[PDB]
Amino acid sequence: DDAKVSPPKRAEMKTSMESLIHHFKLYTEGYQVPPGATYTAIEAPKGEFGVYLVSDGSSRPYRCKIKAPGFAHLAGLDKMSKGHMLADVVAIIGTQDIVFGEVDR
Amino acid sequence: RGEYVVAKLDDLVNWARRSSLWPMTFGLACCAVEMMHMAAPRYDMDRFGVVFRASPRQSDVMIVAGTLTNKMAPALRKVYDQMPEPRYVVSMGSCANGGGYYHYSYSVVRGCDRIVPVDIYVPGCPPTAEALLYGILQLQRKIKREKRLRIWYRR
Amino acid sequence: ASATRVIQLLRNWASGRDLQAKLQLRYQEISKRTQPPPKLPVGPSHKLSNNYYCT
Amino acid sequence: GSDRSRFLEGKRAVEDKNIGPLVKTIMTRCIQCTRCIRFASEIAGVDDLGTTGRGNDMQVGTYIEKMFMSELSGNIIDICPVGALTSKPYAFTARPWETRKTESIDVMDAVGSNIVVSTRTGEVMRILPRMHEDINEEWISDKTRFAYDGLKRQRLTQPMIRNEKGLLTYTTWEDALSRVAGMLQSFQGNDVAAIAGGLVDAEALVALKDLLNRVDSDSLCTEEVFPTAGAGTDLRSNYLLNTTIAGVEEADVILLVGTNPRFEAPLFNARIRKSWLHNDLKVALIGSPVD
Amino acid sequence: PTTKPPTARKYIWTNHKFNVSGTPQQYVPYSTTRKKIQEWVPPSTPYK
Amino acid sequence: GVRTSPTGEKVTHTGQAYDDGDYRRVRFSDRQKEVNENFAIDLIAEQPVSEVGSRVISCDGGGGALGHPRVYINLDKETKTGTCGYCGLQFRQPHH
Amino acid sequence: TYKFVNMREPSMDMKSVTDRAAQTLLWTELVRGLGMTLSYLFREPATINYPFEKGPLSPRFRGEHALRRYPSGEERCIACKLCEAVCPAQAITIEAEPRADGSRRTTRYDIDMTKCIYCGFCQEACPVDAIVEGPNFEFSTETHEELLYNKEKLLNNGDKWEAEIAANIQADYLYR
Amino acid sequence: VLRLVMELSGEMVRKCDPHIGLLHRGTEKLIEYKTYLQALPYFDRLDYVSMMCNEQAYSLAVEKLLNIQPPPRAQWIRVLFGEITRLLNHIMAVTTHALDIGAMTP
Amino acid sequence: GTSVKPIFSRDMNEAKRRVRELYRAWYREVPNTVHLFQLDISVKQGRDKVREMFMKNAHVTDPRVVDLLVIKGKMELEETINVWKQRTHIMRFFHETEAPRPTDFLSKFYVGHDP
Amino acid sequence: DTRPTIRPRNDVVHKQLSAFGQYVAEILPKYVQQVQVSCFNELEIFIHPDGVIPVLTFLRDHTNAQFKSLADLTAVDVPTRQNRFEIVYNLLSLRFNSQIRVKTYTDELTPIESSVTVYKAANWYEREIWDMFGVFFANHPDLRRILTGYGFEGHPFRKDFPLSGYVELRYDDEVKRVVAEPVELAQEFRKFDLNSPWEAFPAYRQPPE
Amino acid sequence: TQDTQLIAVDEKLDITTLTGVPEEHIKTRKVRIFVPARNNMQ
Amino acid sequence: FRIDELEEMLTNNRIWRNRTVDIGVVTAEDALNYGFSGVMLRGSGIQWDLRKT
Amino acid sequence: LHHALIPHGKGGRSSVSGIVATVFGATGFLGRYVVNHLGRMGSQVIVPYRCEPYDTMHLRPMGDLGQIIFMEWNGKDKDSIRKVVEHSNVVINLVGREWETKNFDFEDVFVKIPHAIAQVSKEAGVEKLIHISHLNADIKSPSRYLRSKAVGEKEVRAAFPEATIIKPSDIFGREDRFLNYFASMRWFGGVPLISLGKETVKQPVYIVDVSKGIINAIKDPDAKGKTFAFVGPNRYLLFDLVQYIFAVAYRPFLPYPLPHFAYRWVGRLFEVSPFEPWTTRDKVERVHMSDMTLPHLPGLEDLGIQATPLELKAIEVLRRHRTYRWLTSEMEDVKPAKTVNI
Numbered sequence A: 001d002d003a004k005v006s007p008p009k010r011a012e013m014k015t016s017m018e019s020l021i022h023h024f025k026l027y028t029e030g031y032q033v034p035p036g037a038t039y040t041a042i043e044a045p046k047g048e049f050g051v052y053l054v055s056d057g058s059s060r061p062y063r064c065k066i067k068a069p070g071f072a073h074l075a076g077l078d079k080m081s082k083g084h085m086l087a088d089v090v091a092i093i094g095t096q097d098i099v100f101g102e103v104d105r
Numbered sequence B: 001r002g003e004y005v006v007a008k009l010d011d012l013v014n015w016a017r018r019s020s021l022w023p024m025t026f027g028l029a030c031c032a033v034e035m036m037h038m039a040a041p042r043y044d045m046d047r048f049g050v051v052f053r054a055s056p057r058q059s060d061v062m063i064v065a066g067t068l069t070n071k072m073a074p075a076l077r078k079v080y081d082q083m084p085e086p087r088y089v090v091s092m093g094s095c096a097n098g099g100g101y102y103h104y105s106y107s108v109v110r111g112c113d114r115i116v117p118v119d120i121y122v123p124g125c126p127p128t129a130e131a132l133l134y135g136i137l138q139l140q141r142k143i144k145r146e147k148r149l150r151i152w153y154r155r
Numbered sequence C: 001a002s003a004t005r006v007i008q009l010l011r012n013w014a015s016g017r018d019l020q021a022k023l024q025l026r027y028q029e030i031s032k033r034t035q036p037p038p039k040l041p042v043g044p045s046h047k048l049s050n051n052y053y054c055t
Numbered sequence D: 001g002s003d004r005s006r007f008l009e010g011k012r013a014v015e016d017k018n019i020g021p022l023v024k025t026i027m028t029r030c031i032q033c034t035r036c037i038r039f040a041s042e043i044a045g046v047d048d049l050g051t052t053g054r055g056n057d058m059q060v061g062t063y064i065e066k067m068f069m070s071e072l073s074g075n076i077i078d079i080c081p082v083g084a085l086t087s088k089p090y091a092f093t094a095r096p097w098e099t100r101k102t103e104s105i106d107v108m109d110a111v112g113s114n115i116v117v118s119t120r121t122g123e124v125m126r127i128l129p130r131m132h133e134d135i136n137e138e139w140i141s142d143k144t145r146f147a148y149d150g151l152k153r154q155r156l157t158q159p160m161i162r163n164e165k166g167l168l169t170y171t172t173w174e175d176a177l178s179r180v181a182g183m184l185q186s187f188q189g190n191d192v193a194a195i196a197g198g199l200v201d202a203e204a205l206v207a208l209k210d211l212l213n214r215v216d217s218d219s220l221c222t223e224e225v226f227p228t229a230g231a232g233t234d235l236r237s238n239y240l241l242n243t244t245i246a247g248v249e250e251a252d253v254i255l256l257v258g259t260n261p262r263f264e265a266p267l268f269n270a271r272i273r274k275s276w277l278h279n280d281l282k283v284a285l286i287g288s289p290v291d
Numbered sequence E: 001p002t003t004k005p006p007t008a009r010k011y012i013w014t015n016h017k018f019n020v021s022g023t024p025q026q027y028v029p030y031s032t033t034r035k036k037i038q039e040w041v042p043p044s045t046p047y048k
Numbered sequence F: 001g002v003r004t005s006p007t008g009e010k011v012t013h014t015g016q017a018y019d020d021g022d023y024r025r026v027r028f029s030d031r032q033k034e035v036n037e038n039f040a041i042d043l044i045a046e047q048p049v050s051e052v053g054s055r056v057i058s059c060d061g062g063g064g065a066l067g068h069p070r071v072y073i074n075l076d077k078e079t080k081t082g083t084c085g086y087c088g089l090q091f092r093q094p095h096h
Numbered sequence G: 001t002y003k004f005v006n007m008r009e010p011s012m013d014m015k016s017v018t019d020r021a022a023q024t025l026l027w028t029e030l031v032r033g034l035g036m037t038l039s040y041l042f043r044e045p046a047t048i049n050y051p052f053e054k055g056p057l058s059p060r061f062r063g064e065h066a067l068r069r070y071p072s073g074e075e076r077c078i079a080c081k082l083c084e085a086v087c088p089a090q091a092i093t094i095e096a097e098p099r100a101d102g103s104r105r106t107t108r109y110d111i112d113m114t115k116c117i118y119c120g121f122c123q124e125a126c127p128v129d130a131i132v133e134g135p136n137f138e139f140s141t142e143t144h145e146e147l148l149y150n151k152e153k154l155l156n157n158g159d160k161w162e163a164e165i166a167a168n169i170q171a172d173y174l175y176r
Numbered sequence H: 001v002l003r004l005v006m007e008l009s010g011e012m013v014r015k016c017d018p019h020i021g022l023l024h025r026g027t028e029k030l031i032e033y034k035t036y037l038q039a040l041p042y043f044d045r046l047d048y049v050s051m052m053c054n055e056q057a058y059s060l061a062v063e064k065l066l067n068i069q070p071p072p073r074a075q076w077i078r079v080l081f082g083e084i085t086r087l088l089n090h091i092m093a094v095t096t097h098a099l100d101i102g103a104m105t106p
Numbered sequence I: 001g002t003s004v005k006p007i008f009s010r011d012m013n014e015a016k017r018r019v020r021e022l023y024r025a026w027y028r029e030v031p032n033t034v035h036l037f038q039l040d041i042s043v044k045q046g047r048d049k050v051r052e053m054f055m056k057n058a059h060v061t062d063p064r065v066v067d068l069l070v071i072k073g074k075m076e077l078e079e080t081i082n083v084w085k086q087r088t089h090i091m092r093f094f095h096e097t098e099a100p101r102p103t104d105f106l107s108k109f110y111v112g113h114d115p
Numbered sequence J: 001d002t003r004p005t006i007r008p009r010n011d012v013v014h015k016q017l018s019a020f021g022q023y024v025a026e027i028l029p030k031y032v033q034q035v036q037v038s039c040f041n042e043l044e045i046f047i048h049p050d051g052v053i054p055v056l057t058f059l060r061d062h063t064n065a066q067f068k069s070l071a072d073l074t075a076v077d078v079p080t081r082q083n084r085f086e087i088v089y090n091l092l093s094l095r096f097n098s099q100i101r102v103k104t105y106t107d108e109l110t111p112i113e114s115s116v117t118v119y120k121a122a123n124w125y126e127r128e129i130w131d132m133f134g135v136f137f138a139n140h141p142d143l144r145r146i147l148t149g150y151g152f153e154g155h156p157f158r159k160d161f162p163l164s165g166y167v168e169l170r171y172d173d174e175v176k177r178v179v180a181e182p183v184e185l186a187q188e189f190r191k192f193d194l195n196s197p198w199e200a201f202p203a204y205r206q207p208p209e
Numbered sequence K: 001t002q003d004t005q006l007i008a009v010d011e012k013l014d015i016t017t018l019t020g021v022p023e024e025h026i027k028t029r030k031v032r033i034f035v036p037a038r039n040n041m042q
Numbered sequence L: 001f002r003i004d005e006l007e008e009m010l011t012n013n014r015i016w017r018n019r020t021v022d023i024g025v026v027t028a029e030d031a032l033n034y035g036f037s038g039v040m041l042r043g044s045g046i047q048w049d050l051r052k053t
Numbered sequence M: 001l002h003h004a005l006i007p008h009g010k011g012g013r014s015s016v017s018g019i020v021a022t023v024f025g026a027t028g029f030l031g032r033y034v035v036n037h038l039g040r041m042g043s044q045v046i047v048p049y050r051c052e053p054y055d056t057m058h059l060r061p062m063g064d065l066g067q068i069i070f071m072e073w074n075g076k077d078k079d080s081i082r083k084v085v086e087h088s089n090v091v092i093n094l095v096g097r098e099w100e101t102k103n104f105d106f107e108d109v110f111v112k113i114p115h116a117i118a119q120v121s122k123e124a125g126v127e128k129l130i131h132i133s134h135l136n137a138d139i140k141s142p143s144r145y146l147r148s149k150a151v152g153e154k155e156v157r158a159a160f161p162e163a164t165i166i167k168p169s170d171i172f173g174r175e176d177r178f179l180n181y182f183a184s185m186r187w188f189g190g191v192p193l194i195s196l197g198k199e200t201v202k203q204p205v206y207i208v209d210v211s212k213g214i215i216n217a218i219k220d221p222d223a224k225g226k227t228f229a230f231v232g233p234n235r236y237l238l239f240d241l242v243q244y245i246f247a248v249a250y251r252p253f254l255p256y257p258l259p260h261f262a263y264r265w266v267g268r269l270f271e272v273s274p275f276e277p278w279t280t281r282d283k284v285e286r287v288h289m290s291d292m293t294l295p296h297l298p299g300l301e302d303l304g305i306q307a308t309p310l311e312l313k314a315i316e317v318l319r320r321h322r323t324y325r326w327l328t329s330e331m332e333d334v335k336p337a338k339t340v341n342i
């Protein structure tokens, strides 16, 4: 309900001063985030997916880092297969379920 | 005169090419998954004579599906340079067409055209499967309007 | 994109199940695509009183 | 501030009052902060910008369709918190969250007011005052402010030389420097001169003087004349505002020897006015009875 | 559309156009802006 | 209104028209310079001047929420016609 | 709570061992899959006849950008440049000006479709619903320059796909 | 996109060496030039089989910073569509794995 | 302040030693990378490029910096040796497509505004 | 309730994490510098670089600590501070499920000892930092470049590094290969001037001087 | 107290060659530091 | 009704198992130190899931 | 200079160099290369074509978007030439074939086409024109190629007084049909040199050299009116040249003595194929015709380029013909042939 962080509904946009100004600044500047660093992690279907978001205290972030579930997976992929055949390594990268869009960032 | 025979013959040849183009997949990002959806039951690319699966030696068309990075560029170049003539390359997705979301990156080339000739520019992020399929049909109509032996006879 | 009962019994026996209960298809049961205009609700802080942003 | 409006009634609308081709006026946006009026009274001194009526129908303007044309009028664009008063030449040319800001110095006047050029996409949009407290406070003259449009007009971009008929035709650089070099090499001594203009730079002044010195040409003249009898240009004290601009804020009496500082140097006259206001300066002048 | 007449207005096209790319009726990009800093016109009278 | 250039090109609503030399016209040979005929400059002028009889008039641009934000223009000046900045319809007092 | 997936160890009676030996020797699960795929062979093939039939869509579909205009014919864009400040790919570029009438329309309004990522941020940013994304997806072009749109091209897009956009907005403005 | 520089005594693999970077976009450099509202689609295009899950992660981080909780209906929509995303991504993994192994029908 | 931590080398002498066998490896490498990568580079004009790159960072005098250049060249050496690098990246050092850049002030003035 | 929009406050976790912070501060006073717990119940430990191996091992091994999972490893370049680069280790517990963060500092040249042994997941993460910030890691098993293109230069995530980089690559028929060229954009990145000049949060105001 | 084989290194850091900046960008370019003056419109 | 359908094709099949069963074991202890997560952990045996814990 | 013609940029793809080329017949050999140097620096070339744009896609990469505009042109149409060169500042003529097409006679592609090019160009108002014609062009040479080229040069110079005529010698470079010519001569049995080819000297030039020279002549202010001659640094007698290229290809060399009329018979036999004959009678009358020395013609180094010796860059051109037995061999294994210098 707080309009300072989420855009107001289009009805009050075109009728109310506060909603107009809030939308103008929100899509112009955006919600300035209080300074601080967080590591938010969720259970993405690949694995635990995390963001290290550190914000200096302005309308823009300072540094976001992507913990993708496939990165540590590929890091361990050497120990993963240690004697199995090539058809096995390609059977491994399957349940390894490594999309090369998030590991690679 | 000779235009009749040569036109019928080359019309036959370009029809044969048009209905049997073989994509060289080459999916780099989410555009690959959308192309895979385009080969799913619903749209069924394989119906039109396109075969999706093709080794780069036996293939007619490259779909540059996804963002093309600097590290990739030599590999894509060697892949296309080995592609037998005729070789029409279609670029799918805003990223492959030029720049993309990551237009102003440091390790992403700003368009497949700067790397390889593009025959059909398919827009979308991702281009919804049927838009890709329509780009394929546009390339098919391009192959229909092909006058190789006409130009040979009229060189 | 239903079928003949002769084929209907063949696929069910080969599949070992009663698939007519639900097919991978989707017939008229789908939701209508001309739904009436929805009157969307509002949030908690929509009152015109005691809505001071300080609190 | 809040995040929602409980105003269930109709708003108020105020008709626009034109007060120039220099300031855009939308007086329905005004908040009656009275900054413009106080700027007109104290800073500019032209007491024509005031208020009218009472209540919610109070309107700040000029009542009469008068012509606010002081030398410091443009600064009202930067004192108005809201877009009630804006810059007409720049009117909706760029949203100011895009324009890059680069600091520089005004050259339209010898005051050298610190300014900031707001340029987007390789193009000058407007000039804003920079805070200095010793040169221009945070104000500039309208001449300084609304002068960017001169840059977009008639400009010299490619070298030109006189053709066989006597017309300056465009050409490459090479032949231009070749012609200049040839007939500079031909004539030495006093036969070669150079008259520096008004908006020239010090670096090119040094470069041109040194270049003209290598042929012993010593007629490095300039448009503005200063009596060189006696000390002339030899002593810094002769040709200088020795007491500095800020020094006028503690003076007691000032004598103006036949000048028009309202147009010769608007920022200097603004400083004189502020010292006259606060420090009860007793200003006198000899010369033209300019207001 | 027979049962649902589209709201007619003056600026709508009266003839649908397929994608004109390829054929010489295709669209070509071009700057839709006026000119930047304008050149100074040389005088026409003689040098003297 | 759309008018032809001295070269022959169709001028745009902004006034763009490539000049005589203007080497950047090879882009249009074997193609066309796409220009929209429905000029917004004149398609708003012929609209009638509304004669609503009140001091201050609301304008949302029609369509309610589908229009532009509601602005209150002032029908005060007798020598001209008030207009909403967003849409452009000219509002005027019914000759007072 | 949790469930163990594979702990169902087998028994070792004569019946169970005979069944397992039969399944291994007389291939059965092999035949099971071989018969399931047969059931899928006789089923109704899922396939849409493009381009004669198109895939289902929704009124919110994001596609080709277009510049709408008011019922009077005047373009809705007042060049607030909010959409330019919003586009994450910076594919939008505006130059504004005081028009001959006065209304602040865009001298230049170009969207680089090859930079665009088709998010719909511009339309939700627009305070006058000027910029929008039409239902069209059938604009696969041949040249890269064909994709780089112009103000006139956007106006033509809004004048071609107009009944579409009006109908979709009429069916969607309540949600947004 | 992938590179495995493999060292193998013929069949048993001795030591592998994956080479990621073959689809390298400067997204982590790209975020700190756009606002958070503009930074959202990066996560959508980051793990492109679990879109709404990545968006859930990023959004939860953002309004964790802001000491703001989404409305309950927002939470329910979020979890429902994150689970639809889970179904999508698991279908990806299993089906494409079977494709590698050889099974085409699933 | 002045006191700092080393990477490997203690003094200019030992870092001077490390660059020595780095040049050793580059020398023994150049011919068979020309052979293996099918380079259009020649052997001599392969070696002199290594020499000119080594001379490029002649001004460096801080030890830790020298360990940094030597380990980065070490990574370069691994990238080249086991064919992880590609022929185009090897050519990248040789500026073929890059047009010659003028040096004198007069040519700089003729070309455009640039110091 | 009265605060339906503001996120819930969990003070119990806050106090318990603060108690564990005092615990870990007392256990290893040699390397620990400053421990604090954020408002949203996330504890951070600022340690001296020499404690990269010891502290982590104490967090990986101790019975009452029990952290064996390297959630991620990251550097955050900030040119202002004397040692610009700061490295963050994120650990998650299993027996005592919780997230802990330890933070160290280093400049461009002063090496920071490589964990790897404490957490064999760090390896690839480790490489990233070296390949992305210039922070070399002492005795790392293989600190080769990991993410960027071949024969690259610099370390892109450094805040001084430009957004567009320095050199692109494209086909050249004159040499019949992909070649690297100095940057020449077709349209320059417009840098918008956000961050309005009005103070946002009075709580986090910098003290004057 | 922090024994790590410390060495006095008097001359200033020369991380230039490490940063990878090209020669003309590290030489020709001139950078200025300043406190940005506030927008007088605000 | 199609999830189980996929199961019957893959789960009990001889060659789906043989190509896949007990190839590349990952030790439960060595799994968590390697930073593995998601099903990679759950496959080995650690009862851990962010959705519940 | 026009306000859209001022040079801008730094020589990259998006740099506006200030050149509006036309490169007539750029869909082949040097036409490919010159556009490169025109595309790399940044210039809106108007490359026209008669074939299918397929054989022109290889020009798309060598240019930033919005460049290398393709326009359809016909040889026997003044209107097509006018359309292509209507808006240009330089018109580059490279249209020239090597085999006599049954439809296009030798002279039209070498005088009538160049004459129409020059006339329509001069009428349009293009500043500089650069026509290309073989260095060996003589009015009464036994090969009709050089004769027709000579009359074309005189016609163009008469029509366009300030045209910068270029006289390149035999040019090599990837698809050369000169180095690959003798390289593939093994395919037709042993190499049948006329009288074993001990009496023919050749002065080859690397294609990049001539293309760069064309670019400088565009940028050169005084290039108008003049006539340049493009020669290599060193000159080989024909036999040792064939020796060198065969050694570089490592294919066995079997020189075959042959009378001039016998090679004429073989050329007439080869001229009957219906597509791209490997050799022609006129080609035979060209190869044995040694390239003369024209010192009074301003050469190549005066423009600014440095001639690249054939030995340095023969590897790339002859590399493909090498079999896998020596496909891994470098340049230094082959010692440079015994050049017959001045």
Ligand SMILES: NC(=O)C1=CN([C@@H]2O[C@H](COP(=O)(O)OP(=O)(O)OC[C@H]3O[C@@H](n4cnc5c(N)ncnc54)[C@H](OP(=O)(O)O)[C@@H]3O)[C@@H](O)[C@H]2O)C=CC1
Pocket (backbone or CB within 6 Å): B155, M024, M025, M026, M027, M028, M029, M030, M031, M049, M050, M051, M075, M094, M095, M096, M097, M098, M104, M109, M132, M133, M134, M135, M168, M169, M170, M171, M172, M176, M178
């Ligand atoms: N070693 C050499 O090659 C030397 C060449 N030259 C001269 O260089 C010129 C070009 O040589 P090169 O590029 O190798 O020749 P190519 O035959 O390889 O290419 C000729 C070029 O001109 C076009 N062209 C040729 N003939 C015609 C025609 N009749 N009608 C229309 N277009 C035509 C071709 O397009 P298309 O294929 O579609 O016809 C192509 O763009 C010729 O004048 C030649 O005499 C001079 C000295 C040495």
Ligand code: SF4
Pocket (backbone or CB within 6 Å): B029, B030, B031, B065, B066, B067, B092, B093, B094, B095, B096, B100, B101, B124, B125, B126, B127, G117, H045
């Ligand atoms: S264009 Fe969009 S969908 Fe395609 S690769 Fe780029 S971000 Fe992904």
Ligand code: SF4
Pocket (backbone or CB within 6 Å): D029, D030, D031, D032, D033, D034, D035, D036, D037, D060, D079, D080, D081, D082, D084, D085
């Ligand atoms: S400065 Fe502007 S807002 Fe303030 S009173 Fe004057 S007109 Fe109104």
Ligand code: SF4
Pocket (backbone or CB within 6 Å): D029, D081, D082, D083, D084
């Ligand atoms: S931006 Fe400010 S001045 Fe302009 S209309 Fe909005 S509130 Fe009024």
Ligand code: SF4
Pocket (backbone or CB within 6 Å): G065, G083, G086, G087, G088, G089, G090, G091, G092, G111, G115, G116, G117, G118, G119, G120, G121, G122, G123
């Ligand atoms: S969808 Fe529209 S607003 Fe969003 S990036 Fe694309 S063009 Fe810009």
Ligand code: SF4
Pocket (backbone or CB within 6 Å): G076, G077, G078, G079, G080, G081, G082, G083, G084, G094, G122, G125, G126, G127, G128, G129, G130, G131
């Ligand atoms: S947001 Fe809408 S009104 Fe504003 S500039 Fe963009 S299109 Fe125009």
Ligand SMILES: [K+]
Pocket (backbone or CB within 6 Å): D076, D077, D078, D079, D080, D081, D082, D083, D084, D085, D086, K041
């Ligand atoms: K103002």
Ligand SMILES: [Zn+2]
Pocket (backbone or CB within 6 Å): F059, F060, F061, F068, F084, F085, F086, F087, F088, F089
């Ligand atoms: Zn209105």
